[PDB]
Amino acid sequence: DPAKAAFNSLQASATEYIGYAWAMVVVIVGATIGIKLFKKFTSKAS
Amino acid sequence: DPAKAAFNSLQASATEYIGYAWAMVVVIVGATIGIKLFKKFTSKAS
Amino acid sequence: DPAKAAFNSLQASATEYIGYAWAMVVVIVGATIGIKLFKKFTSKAS
Amino acid sequence: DPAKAAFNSLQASATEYIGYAWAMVVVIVGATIGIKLFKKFTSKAS
Amino acid sequence: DPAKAAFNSLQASATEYIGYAWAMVVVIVGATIGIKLFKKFTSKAS
Amino acid sequence: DPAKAAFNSLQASATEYIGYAWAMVVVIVGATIGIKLFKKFTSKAS
Amino acid sequence: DPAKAAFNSLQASATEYIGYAWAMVVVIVGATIGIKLFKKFTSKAS
Amino acid sequence: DPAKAAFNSLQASATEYIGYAWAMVVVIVGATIGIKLFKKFTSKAS
Amino acid sequence: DPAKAAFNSLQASATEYIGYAWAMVVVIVGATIGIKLFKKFTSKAS
Amino acid sequence: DPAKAAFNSLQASATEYIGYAWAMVVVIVGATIGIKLFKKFTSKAS
Amino acid sequence: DPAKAAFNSLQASATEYIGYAWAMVVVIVGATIGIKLFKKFTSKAS
Amino acid sequence: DPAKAAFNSLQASATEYIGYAWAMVVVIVGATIGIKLFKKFTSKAS
Amino acid sequence: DPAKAAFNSLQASATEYIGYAWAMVVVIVGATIGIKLFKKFTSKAS
Amino acid sequence: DPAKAAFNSLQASATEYIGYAWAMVVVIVGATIGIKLFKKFTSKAS
Amino acid sequence: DPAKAAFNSLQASATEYIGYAWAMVVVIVGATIGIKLFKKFTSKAS
Amino acid sequence: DPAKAAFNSLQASATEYIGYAWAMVVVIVGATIGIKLFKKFTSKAS
Amino acid sequence: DPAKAAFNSLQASATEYIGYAWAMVVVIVGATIGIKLFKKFTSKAS
Amino acid sequence: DPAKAAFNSLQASATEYIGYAWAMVVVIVGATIGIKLFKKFTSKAS
Amino acid sequence: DPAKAAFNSLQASATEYIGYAWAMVVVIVGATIGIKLFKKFTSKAS
Amino acid sequence: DPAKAAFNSLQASATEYIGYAWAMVVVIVGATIGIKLFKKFTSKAS
Amino acid sequence: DPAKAAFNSLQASATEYIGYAWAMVVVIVGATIGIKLFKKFTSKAS
Amino acid sequence: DPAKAAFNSLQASATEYIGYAWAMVVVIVGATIGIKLFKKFTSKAS
Amino acid sequence: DPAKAAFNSLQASATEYIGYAWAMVVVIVGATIGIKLFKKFTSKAS
Amino acid sequence: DPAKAAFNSLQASATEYIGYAWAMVVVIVGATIGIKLFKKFTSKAS
Amino acid sequence: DPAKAAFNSLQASATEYIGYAWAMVVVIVGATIGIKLFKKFTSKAS
Amino acid sequence: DPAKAAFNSLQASATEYIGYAWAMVVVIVGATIGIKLFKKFTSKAS
Amino acid sequence: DPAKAAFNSLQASATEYIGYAWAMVVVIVGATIGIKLFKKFTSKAS
Amino acid sequence: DPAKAAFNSLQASATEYIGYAWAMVVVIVGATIGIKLFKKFTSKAS
Amino acid sequence: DPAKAAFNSLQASATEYIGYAWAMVVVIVGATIGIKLFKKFTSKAS
Amino acid sequence: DPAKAAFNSLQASATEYIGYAWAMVVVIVGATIGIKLFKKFTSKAS
Amino acid sequence: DPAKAAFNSLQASATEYIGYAWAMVVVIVGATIGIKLFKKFTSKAS
Amino acid sequence: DPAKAAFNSLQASATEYIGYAWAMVVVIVGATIGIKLFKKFTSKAS
Amino acid sequence: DPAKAAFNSLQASATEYIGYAWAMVVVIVGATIGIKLFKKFTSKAS
Amino acid sequence: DPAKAAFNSLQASATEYIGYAWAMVVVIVGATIGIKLFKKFTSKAS
Amino acid sequence: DPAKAAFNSLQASATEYIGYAWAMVVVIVGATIGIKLFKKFTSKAS
Amino acid sequence: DPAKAAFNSLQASATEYIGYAWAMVVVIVGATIGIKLFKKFTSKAS
Amino acid sequence: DPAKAAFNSLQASATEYIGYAWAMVVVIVGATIGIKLFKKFTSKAS
Amino acid sequence: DPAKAAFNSLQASATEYIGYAWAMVVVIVGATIGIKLFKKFTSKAS
Amino acid sequence: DPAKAAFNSLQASATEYIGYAWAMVVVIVGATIGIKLFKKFTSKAS
Amino acid sequence: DPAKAAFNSLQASATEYIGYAWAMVVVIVGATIGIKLFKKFTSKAS
């Protein structure tokens, strides 16, 4: 079925995009949470 | 009647399309909800 | 009248086709509405 | 006149055919409108 | 007048032939118009 | 004049035959025109 | 006069022949007109 | 004139046939227009 | 009358041909209407 | 009367020929009307 | 007129669809508002 | 003119059908607008 | 000239027949065109 | 001369017969042309 | 000329039919546009 | 020459009859062409 | 030539009928076009 | 022209619809803005 | 050419109808845009 | 040859009648085609 | 010889009659063919 | 006007919904502002 | 009758053509509906 | 009767010609109707 | 009598010639009717 | 040839009608496109 | 042989008349075919 | 029989022409259907 | 018998001419039917 | 042969008329296609 | 046989006329069908 | 015998005249049939 | 009613989705409020 | 056969016209699809 | 049947075109869905 | 240009709405900033 | 070509509409951005 | 072939119109996309 | 088939459009994500 | 390719808008971050 192959390729492409999205969000959140913890720990320790 | 068999085949084809659509939407929504919960919980815990 | 039996056979065929249509539209609309509710509720619950 | 009786019997046959046509159109229009309203009201409710 | 009798007999023959002709006309024209109206009403009803 | 009486008899006989002929012509044409008009108007009305 | 009596005999004999001729003319003309009208009315009827 | 009376009779017969034709066309056209407007207005309302 | 029997035979033959014509038109019109309604209802269901 | 017997023989002969002619006319017209009606009804049915 | 009864039946069918739609929308909106108020009040109280 | 009464009857039928249409559309539009306002106001009030 | 009188009388007969023919033509053509315009205008107005 | 007088008598008698012949011709030709034009104009009128 | 009067009376009948058609089209177009504007303005206001 | 005078009279008589015939032909054709053109132009205009 | 005058008269009559035909077609076509443009522009404006 | 009056009436009908729509939208927007300002000012003041 | 005046009258009627259309669309579009701006600005200002 | 002159004169008559016929043909066909093109172009332009 | 001279006289007289006959034939045939072609070309022209 | 009554009923229904919306928002805001003031006053007083 | 066999063989050929038509329409309708459902379900899932 | 034999032989010739005619009719009409149905079914299936 | 014997011889000889004439008539009439029916049936068949 | 001039004059009339049609279509298309673009650009700007 | 010379003269005269007849036939047919083709091609081109 | 061979030859010629007609109609119908499906499928794909 | 031999020769001559006539008839009809069928099938195929 | 030259002349005349017909149809079809494509492309661009 | 030669010469004339007729038929029918296909293909391509 | 020799001379002279008659018949019949077929085939060709 | 069963199944499916949504939101809110209370109580107690 | 060559040359001309039609439809369809895809992809990218 | 091969070739052409359509729609839909997912995921990840 | 005036009035109406929006936002912001400053200054001063 | 000038005029009209739209959107967006920045900066500064 | 030049001129006209369409759509789409980007970027930047 | 090449060319054109769309969307989304991240990181760091 | 140039100009216009957007966002963010740092540093230093 052409439709079966089409739907399978669309789902495979979606999975690749999800992989890239997760890589980017990890990098962004790492920085936001890192900066938050640094500012919090520096002031608290002082 | 040829129409009876034709209508039945089209309904079976629609059922196949619904199966493909549900599989893709589960993957798509799963990633969306996962990223949302990840950012939310990370902010609350840190 | 040969027409009386002809018109009757055509109206019986129409009634059969309306039943095949009301079985396909239930399946298709049910799936689309189900996907809509699934995405909506997952977003609100998360 | 023979033509008088002929014209009257033809106008009688035409009236019978009109009745058959009206009965069939009611069923078909009812089905098409029913499916249209079903889809509209379902989408609005969801 | 043998001629008067001849003309009178010729008219009865003509009148009979006219009756036979009218009967066949009604049957044939009724059928053709019946098929015409049948096709027209079926198309509009569908 | 015997010859005059003869001419007068044959002319009177001709007039009789002309009257009989005219009556038959009216009957034949009326039937034909009736059939023609019936077919035409039945086709037009439908 | 014997000659006058002979004339009367000739006239009476001729009258008999005129009657026989009229009977022959009626049947022959009837067939000719009958077949003519049959073909005419059958054509118009069909 | 024999023709004068014959022509008048044929014109009167034509007028009668016109009356029958008008009655039939009114019934048929009325039904076809009614079905058309019914389908149109049902669609607009829905 | 020879013409009487001939006219009756032709009218009977016409009735037989009308029966064959009605059978064929029912089959053809039924198929065309069926294909039309099939395409219409499949579109509405989808 | 020898002349009477002669007229009687020729009239009887004419009647025989008229009967033969009528039979042939029925066969020829029946065929033509059959072909005409077959073509007309075949065109109408389709 | 058949149209009058047909229009009345279609309006009655529309009323039934409206009843089904309102029941579903009350359940759907009830859940949506309930979840929203639940999260809001829990956050304010705690 | 038979047409004057025919056109008048058609315009009277049209006026009746427009009234049946303006009764169905009021019910349908009223319901859809009511559902829209219901969802909108419940969201803002909550 | 008995011939001049014959030709003059023949023309008056022809002129009368032409008047009768024209009267019948106006009635028949008026009706056919009236039905044609009626059907056309009803369809466009609807 | 008695012979010359006899010639004059023959000429006068012939003139009378020519007049009777002309009257007969006028009525017969009038009927023939009248029926011809009647059939022609009735056909064109219808 | 008889045709002159005939053409003029036909052009008069056509003008009357145009008036009837215009009156009907105004009512039908008014209703369709009225329903269209009602739905549009109601949706915009809500 | 008496024979010459005779030929001259018959030729003059023929010319008279030819003139009368031409006048009648113009009247008959004019009527027929008028009816034909009236029907054609009335059909075309509508 | 009698034919020359007759042909010229028939051509003049044809020209008159063309003038009547053009007047009628202008009125009818104008009305049909006007109704068409009216419906089109009302829809575009709404 | 009937179209001129029809277009003017439709424009007047549109003006009425606009008046109804503006009245409803003022009430609808008034409530929306009122609730928004109520919640905002209450939070700021308290 | 009668057509030159006919085509000119049709183009003049078109120009008039375009003006009636450009007066209705200005009113309708103006109202819809006014309602859109009203709702948008009230929301931002509040 | 009085015959040669007769044939030569007959041709000139025929040639004149052909010229008259062609002139009338051009006028009638020009009008019918003009109306045909007028109706076609008006419909496409509108 | 007187007999030979008489023969010559008969031949010369016959030649004169042949000439008169030819003149008569030309005018009569001219009218017959002229009316025939007039009717033929008028029919084709219309 | 059916449209007038429809628009008036829609506005009346909207006013009822606005009444319910205001009742609900007063209850919600009472609680949110009450809890806020309680927490604020309790801590400040302590 | 030869026509009986002819009508039967034509109704047999028509049935064969109906089978070919139904087979083709099933393939084409299946493809169009398949593409329609594919696009709809894909868009909804994404 | 040599005439009876002649009439009998003429009928067999006629009957043979009718058989030949019917055979050719079936072939030609079958082909024309086959092409007609082929074009109709191909268009509807596509 | 020798004269009586001669009469008998003449009658017998005439009978022979009547037979030869009948054979000639049969073949000639057969060809005439055969070609007539051939042309008639070939035309109807095509 | 008269036909040559006739064909040329008809091709000249057709060219004139094409010019009138093009002028009218430009005005109508300009108006419809103008209204379409007006509504589109206004909505986008607001 | 005087008789031979006579036959030779009449045959030569016949050939002359045949040549004149052929010339006239060409002129008449050419005109008729020209008119027929002009009408046909003018109808087809438009 | 000469007619037997002639009828058979004409039927064979008809069969040959049917073969040529079928070949041409297949090519033309195939192209028109192909263009139709090409435009339809390109639109669906886009 | 010399008279018998004469009748036999004329009958043989008639048969020869009948054979020649039949051959010419076949050639003429074949051509006409071929042209008719070519035109019909060429029109149908396209 | 006189007919040979006549047939050749008529075929040449037909070719000339075909040239005039092709010129006119190219101009008319070109204009109608141009107007169609103009309206289509303006709509697509807008 | 001078008759055999006459029949043989008549056939060659007929065969030539058939060749000339067929040539003209091909040219005329080719042109009409060419214009028909041209108009059809231009419309579908556009 | 001188009488027998005279008989032989008469027979030989008659044979010469029969030959001259046959030559005359051939040319006259050829022209009649030639013009008939020319008109027939030109009509079918066009 | 197929619509009744369809609407009932859709509402039942919605109720199931609402059950899952409530389960998920309880789990999420439990964690967010638990973490909030823990952090608040730990710091306050210290 | 001349018809064989004619049918073949017509099928050759039809094939040429199909080629021209296909070339034109490719260009027009390419342009319409190109504009459609351009607008779609541009809107999606922006 | 030539139709059996014709219908088969048309269904084979349809199957080929459906494959070309299912290759273009996969590419187009794939691209549009890919762009949708790209924009959606980039927004959520950032 | 009607469009120019329409666009100018829409822009003027927009400018008025902007004036009202700015008046309302100044009042709202005055209060929010006033309350903020009051609360801030009161506590800071204390 | 008239189309060239028409297309150029429509493109010029589109350019005018774009100029009006850009002017209005600058005013509309200017107010929107101005109010947003006003509220934002006032809150930050105070 | 006159068609070859006709089809070529039509394809050249199509190519010209496609260029005028691709110049208008670029301007219109460019403006709409420009307005979209303008509003989007101003909002994000502010 | 020309369709095969046409479909392939259209798919290649679609691929080109997809390439242009992806390039533009990367630039557009890149700027959008860049501005969002710029504002977010600047606020977090400062 | 017109599409290539169009897509390239759209991308170039987008790049210019991105340049302006970045300039504006730098100015806005400079102020918001500047005010934030000033307020923070002033209070902290004090």
Numbering used by the authors:
A (entry chain G), B (entry chain F), C (entry chain P), D (entry chain S), E (entry chain N), F (entry chain Q), ...: 5 to 50
Q: What do the study authors state?
A:
Filamentous bacteriophages package their circular, single stranded DNA genome with the major coat protein pVIII and the minor coat proteins pIII, pVII, pVI, and pIX. Here, we report the cryo-EM structure of a ~500 Å long bacteriophage M13 mini variant. The distal ends of the mini phage are sealed by two cap-like complexes composed of the minor coat proteins. We further performed local refinements of the mini phage by dividing the particle into the top, middle and bottom three segments.
The middle part of the M13 miniphage consists of 20 protein layers (from layer 4 to layer 23) of pVIII assembling to form a cylindrical capsid with an outer diameter of ~60 Å and an inner diameter of ~24 Å. Similar to the pVIII assembly in the wild-type phage, the pVIII molecules in the layers overlap with their neighboring subunits, resembling fish scales, and form right-handed spirals in the symmetric cylindrical shell. The helical parameters of the pVIII array determined by the real space search with Relion22, are 36.60° for the twist and 16.36 Å for the helical rise, which are similar to the values of 36.40° for the twist and 16.60 Å for the rise determined by solid-state NMR15. Further helical averaging of the reconstruction improved the overall resolution of the EM map to 2.7 Å. Each pVIII interacts with eight neighboring pVIII proteins in six different layers primarily through hydrophobic interactions, hydrogen bonds and salt bridges. The twist and rise of the helical array are ~36° and ~16 Å, respectively, which are similar to the reported parameters for the helical array of the major coat protein pVIII in previous studies. The inner surface of the capsid is decorated with the positively charged residues K40, K43, K44, and K48, which are clustered in one region of pVIII. The distribution of the positively charge region in the capsid follows the symmetry of the capsid, which, however, is not consistent with that of either the A- or B-form dsDNA. However, the number of contacts varies when a symmetric capsid structure built with the helical averaged map was used. Furthermore, the plot calculated with the symmetric capsid shows no distinct peaks, indicating that the capsid with a uniform and symmetric conformation is unlikely able to establish a unique interaction with the ssDNA and trap the ssDNA at a specific position.
